Design a protein around this ligand. Structure first.
Ligand SMILES: N[C@@H](Cc1ccccc1)C(=O)O
Ligand SMILES: [Fe+3]
Length: 268
């Protein structure tokens, strides 16, 4: 039995949107201490690494440093800033429900936390949610959600997911102060936060819609390529055109491997 099944023994979910109210009972003191340790460790590590918008979202959303946050209390601030809410889910959900959530400004957050010794509540909430404070990033995510139906209609969801992976989960952003991180999967990771900026090993490549959507990724370890945007506005702009011809042109195409450099990459 996996972590999700194990964590969810005895609980339920809405039949339509796979949400539940956050099971606030069921958090044990060990959950709060684990949350606090993880939060603490990231907060000491992230200055001069996370983009400023991330660190600032933690503050403005008052993401508890010493316990798993109350989703509702967080939603009060999140709704007021950008019209988004978080919804508690049991873990991985059907993609149809996920896109529909994002299209509706609901951000699905796994309710449970890893054990001290899968996306969990730390990755989903610490990693993803602080950035929903940035209106352009907030709109990009909504646009992404809506983009689900066209990609589904075209059998191109894997191409859309690569885009999401390489921006929302593992995106880097170039600033006048140097490279910073906006990808949630990095930001909730001690070692990957270090690696993605410090190491000479991974490829660091200028964002390019078509290349990203034709690029495989790594699910069990650090990424081998990171894609770098100039701003949230550039990212929103570049992802505003009709994706339909892009999806069709890549239909019979062979994808770049997670570690490839493409002939026309802007490499760093
Ligand atoms: N422009 C995309 C929608 C989208 C926007 C932003 C992110 C992902 C997808 C389309 O034509 O389908
Ligand atoms: Fe994530």
């Amino acid at each position: 039995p996996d972590i999700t099944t194990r964590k969810n023994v005895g609980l339920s979910h809405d039949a339509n949107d796979f949400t539940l109210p956050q099971p606030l009972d069921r958090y044990s003191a060990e959950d709060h201490a684990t949350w606090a340790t993880l939060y603490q460790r990231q907060c000491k590590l992230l200055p001069g690494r996370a983009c400023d918008e991330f660190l600032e979202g933690l503050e403005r959303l008052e993401v508890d440093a010493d316990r798993v946050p109350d989703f509702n209390k967080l939603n009060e601030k999140l709704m007021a800033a950008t019209g988004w809410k978080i919804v508690a889910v049991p873990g991985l959900i059907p993609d149809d429900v996920f896109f529909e959530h994002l299209a509706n400004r609901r951000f699905p957050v796994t309710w449970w936390l890893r054990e001290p010794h899968e996306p969990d509540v730390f990755h989903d909430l610490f990693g993803h949610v602080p950035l929903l404070i940035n209106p352009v990033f907030a709109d990009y995510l909504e646009a992404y959600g809506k983009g689900g139906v066209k990609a589904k209609a075209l059998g191109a969801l894997p191409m859309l997911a690569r885009l999401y992976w390489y921006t929302v989960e593992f995106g880097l952003i170039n600033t006048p102060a140097g490279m910073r991180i906006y990808g949630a999967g990095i930001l909730s990771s001690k070692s990957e936060s270090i690696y993605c900026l410090d190491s000479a090993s991974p490829n660091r490549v200028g964002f390019d819609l078509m290349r990203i959507m034709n690029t495989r990724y790594r699910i069990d370890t650090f990424q081998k390529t990171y894609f770098v945007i100039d701003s949230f506005k550039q990212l929103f702009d570049a992802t505003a055109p009709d994706f339909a011809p892009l999806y069709l042109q890549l239909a019979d195409a062979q994808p770049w491997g997670a570690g490839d450099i493409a002939p026309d990459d802007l490499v760093l």
